[PDB]
Ligand binder design. Structure first.
Ligand SMILES: Cc1cccc(C)c1OCC(=O)N(Cc1ccccc1)C[C@H]1CNC[C@@H]1CN(CC(C)C)S(=O)(=O)c1ccccc1
Ligand SMILES: [Cl-]
Ligand SMILES: [Cl-]
Lengths: 99, 99
């Protein structure tokens, strides 16, 4: 698809058999998801931006399907207001910036 | 141009006669640059960040050339981790996401 920037680039994602809204974010190195329960072990991490930092849980090899495209990689889970799809998964699905 | 995302989409911008590096950030509503002097009036503005809002200076109708594309719009100046070009100016240069 081609996603416009007149609005936040929100798309539907699926993790497990859960569908969620997520932002396609070229400024994010990493993918950050709203608080949710994922199986398995993880690593503590702190991620930051304007304002400061929040604590997240790093899970590896997590499948997220983005508009029918299956991406697998590291996800961070924490108290974010928005599900953020970062470059680590945007590359896998063939996403580019064009102008 | 077509920009892939295996690295940060950092580009050269020209603002106030200065060359700077900035990040093309579809996850950002607004363009936010590190502390600099800009011509004309500014107004205090609070913008949302991690763990709360942050003060920035708002300058309107500022010329910015991003990769050779002209934009004229609002630039916020404040304590951002990196110079970010957000959707307010990404729409002006014709940017979309594609996969
Ligand atoms: C605004 C806000 C409120 C509360 C919580 C969150 C998560 C939040 O968003 C932060 C966020 O969206 N992140 C950062 C983030 C996401 C998830 C958890 C923590 C931080 C993604 C990066 C990339 N795309 C937009 C952001 C660009 N950043 C610059 C970047 C180099 C970090 S930045 O420092 O946040 C920023 C935001 C606004 C103005 C100026 C600068
Ligand atoms: Cl990854
Ligand atoms: Cl603007």
């Amino acid at each position: 698809p081609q996603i416009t920037l007149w609005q936040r680039p929100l798309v539907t994602i699926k993790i497990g058999g859960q569908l969620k809204e997520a932002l396609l974010d070229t400024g994010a190195d990493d993918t950050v998801l709203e608080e949710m329960s994922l199986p398995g072990r993880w690593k503590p991490k702190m991620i930051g931006g304007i304002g400061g930092f929040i604590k997240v849980r790093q899970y590896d090899q997590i499948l997220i399907e983005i508009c029918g495209h299956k991406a697998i990689g590291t996800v961070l889970v924490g108290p974010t207001p928005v599900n953020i799809i970062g470059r680590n998964l945007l590359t896998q699905i063939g996403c580019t910036l064009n102008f």
